[PDB]
Amino acid sequence: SSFSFGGFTFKRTSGSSVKKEEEVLTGNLQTLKIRVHEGYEEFTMVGRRATAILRKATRRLIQLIVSGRDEQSIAEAIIVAMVFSQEDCMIKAVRGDLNFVNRANQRLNPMHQLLRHFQKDAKVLFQNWGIESIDNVMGMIGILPDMTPSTEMSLRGIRVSKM
């Protein structure tokens, strides 16, 4: 029930999915054969400096609650979750070709390609994801596309659990 992605251990806590291959065009008009997880799943994410609860459906982030020691540790977890979501807006936020390889010169898996692209610079990803008005929930806060806190708005589906 656990696996690694992007520096985080993911643990599925509920749900299930079936893989279906889909061929999409990235935002840079490159073909990419993604391995789409169809179904609704709940996960925890545990990294060195950040943790999260993630609920998602097929190519759709429903809820992400993130905790972390600072804005950029939090940002790291968000990037990973947005890529893992497989959302169309994330695919379309790509701005360069995906040709990443490991030290054996083997091409990274598609979801790794995407993660490595956004790990260059996540600004377009974050700007394109979507924002929403929020309610002022005790112990929680919004996070804006520039990774600063807000009590009025947040990235869509995403909240930060404060200390």
TrEMBL record:
Residues 1-163 form the Influenza RNA polymerase PB2 CAP binding domain. It is found in: Host mitochondrion. Transmembrane segments: none annotated. It comes from the Viruses. Belongs to the influenza viruses PB2 family. Plays an essential role in transcription initiation and cap-stealing mechanism, in which cellular capped pre-mRNAs are used to generate primers for viral transcription. Recognizes and binds the 7-methylguanosine-containing cap of the target pre-RNA which is subsequently cleaved after 10-13 nucleotides by the viral protein PA. Plays a role in the initiation of the viral genome replication and modulates the activity of the ribonucleoprotein (RNP) complex. This is Polymerase basic protein 2. It comes from Influenza A virus. The chain holds residues 108 to 270 of 546 of the full protein.
